[PDB]
């Protein structure tokens, strides 16, 4: 029936860029919190 | 050797994050069937 290599293609192409973007957002927010003095270092 | 004077930071809004997530998921939805064939 279907190709058994697509699974890897679809799942990796969905997860890896999504985690990359989540990483970018998290580090942006962490830097923003660090710049402003507060309970977060 | 030394502290490079050209080092800047990187930013991404939450709206940019939502746009990127939506784009990635919609691209996967569009191309998944074609990859499966």
């Amino acid at each position: 029936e279907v190709q058994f290599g697509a699974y890897l293609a679809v799942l990796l192409g969905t997860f890896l860029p999504a985690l990359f973007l989540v990483n970018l957002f998290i580090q942006t927010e962490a830097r923003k919190a660090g710049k402003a003095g507060g309970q977060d270092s | 050797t030394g502290p490079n004077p050209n080092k800047q930071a990187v930013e991404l809004n939450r709206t940019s994050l939502y746009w990127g997530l939506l784009l990635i998921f919609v691209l996967a939805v569009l191309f998944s069937s074609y990859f499966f064939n």
Partner: peptide
């Protein structure tokens, strides 16, 4: 078995849409 993948992708897209409406950056003036 690919029906599971299709359903997962659709539900994930819907969840992303959900988070972009009720968890948005509040725009202030």
């Amino acid at each position: 078995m690919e029906a599971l993948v299709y359903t997962f992708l659709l539900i994930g897209t819907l969840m992303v849409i959900f988070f972009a409406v009720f968890f948005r950056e509040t725009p202030r003036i």
